Amino acid sequence: IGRISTGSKSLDKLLGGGIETQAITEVFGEFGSGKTQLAHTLAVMVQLPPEEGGLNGKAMYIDTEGTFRPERLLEIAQNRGLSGSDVLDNVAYARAFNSNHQMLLVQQASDMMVELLNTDRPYKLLIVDSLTSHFRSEYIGRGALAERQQKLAKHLADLHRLANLYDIAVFVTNQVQANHILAHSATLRVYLRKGKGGKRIARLIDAPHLPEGEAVFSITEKGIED
Ligand SMILES: [Cl-]
Ligand SMILES: [Cl-]
Numbered sequence: 001i002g003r004i005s006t007g008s009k010s011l012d013k014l015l016g017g018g019i020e021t022q023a024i025t026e027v028f029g030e031f032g033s034g035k036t037q038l039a040h041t042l043a044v045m046v047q048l049p050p051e052e053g054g055l056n057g058k059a060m061y062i063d064t065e066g067t068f069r070p071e072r073l074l075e076i077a078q079n080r081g082l083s084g085s086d087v088l089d090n091v092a093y094a095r096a097f098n099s100n101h102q103m104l105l106v107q108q109a110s111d112m113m114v115e116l117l118n119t120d121r122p123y124k125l126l127i128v129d130s131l132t133s134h135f136r137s138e139y140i141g142r143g144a145l146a147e148r149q150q151k152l153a154k155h156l157a158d159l160h161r162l163a164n165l166y167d168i169a170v171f172v173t174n175q176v177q178a179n180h181i182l183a184h185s186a187t188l189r190v191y192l193r194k195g196k197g198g199k200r201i202a203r204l205i206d207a208p209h210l211p212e213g214e215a216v217f218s219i220t221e222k223g224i225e226d
Contacts, residue, residue: 004125004169005053007041007224008217011202015188016210018053021124021169024159024185026131027202028174029192034200034219035173036067038192039127041223042171043091044076046125057124058116060092062105064133068093076223090121099134099151106158113166123168128159131172132182149183156185 003018012018019025019042027035043061048054061068070088077087092112096102109126116122132152139148163170172186189205202215218225 002050002055004042004055005045005048006038006217007045007053007222008215009226010215011217011224011226012053014202014204014210014213014215015190019169019171020187021055021167022163023187024156024163024170024172025188025190026172026174026186027190027192028176028205030177030194031175033192033194034224035175035192036129037219038224039129039171039173040069040072041076042125042169043127044073044080044082044087044223046169047082047087047090048080055124056121058090058092058121059125059127060094060109060112060123061127062094062096062102062109062129064096064102064128064130066095067129068095072223075221079220079222092123096134099138099155102128102134103151103155103158106155106162110162110165113162113168117166123166126159126162126168126170127172128170129173131155131174132184133175135182136180152182152184160185 003020005012005018043059045054046057046059049056073087074084077084094105096105113123135148135152159170188207191203191205193201198219200217
């Protein structure tokens with residue numbers, strides 16, 4: 001029973017070994033709290049052998065706001081003693097321009113995953129960065145709200161089905177600001193915040209069975225570290 005290491009030993013302990021397959025892990029926080037950095041690191045980590053904290057897997061990265069950085073991936077990979085070429089090849093990138101496209105990409109994801117399912121290097125990670133931004137900007141005023149929840153609930157149900165069918169970890173980011181409220185399902189929720197300079201603090205939010213707590217981690221050349 002394998003898990004995906006975050007690159008941080010303290011964060012992994014908080015998560016029971018790392019982020020799980022057949023589950024939706026959400027990281028939520030303000031802008032600059034390291035949600036995208038954690039997503040980039042996991043996209044590299046998944047490719048690693050189990051002994052190095054990975055699952056010899058492929059990753060898919062759905063980018064809704066234009067935050068994906070292939071150069072950052074090359075940097076993380078090189079700093080972890082890996083081929084930069086192979087890392088970029090093993091991260092399937094999809095730029096989502098609206099909520100409809102974002103939802104459709106979850107079927108496209110299914111198609112590419114069923115094909116690699118029984119192979120040596122299957123998909124093991126799906127990143128949605130960020131899960132709710134398109135739902136927040138598109139459904140304007142009352143009268144758009146019932147449909148906004150209907151669409152979001154359907155999108156999360158598609159992600160859950162995908163995680164269970166293909167034994168993949170679904171890692172999602174969500175910008176929750178101190179000052180819109182988009183209720184949705186997640187297996188695990190983690191609150192992220194700054195942070196003593198480059199230090200980030202992670203807190204488990206109503207995690208079932210896992211003991212309550214916090215983990216401190218850094219944003220380095222290696223992505224995420226203790
Ligand atoms: Cl393959
Ligand atoms: Cl909603």
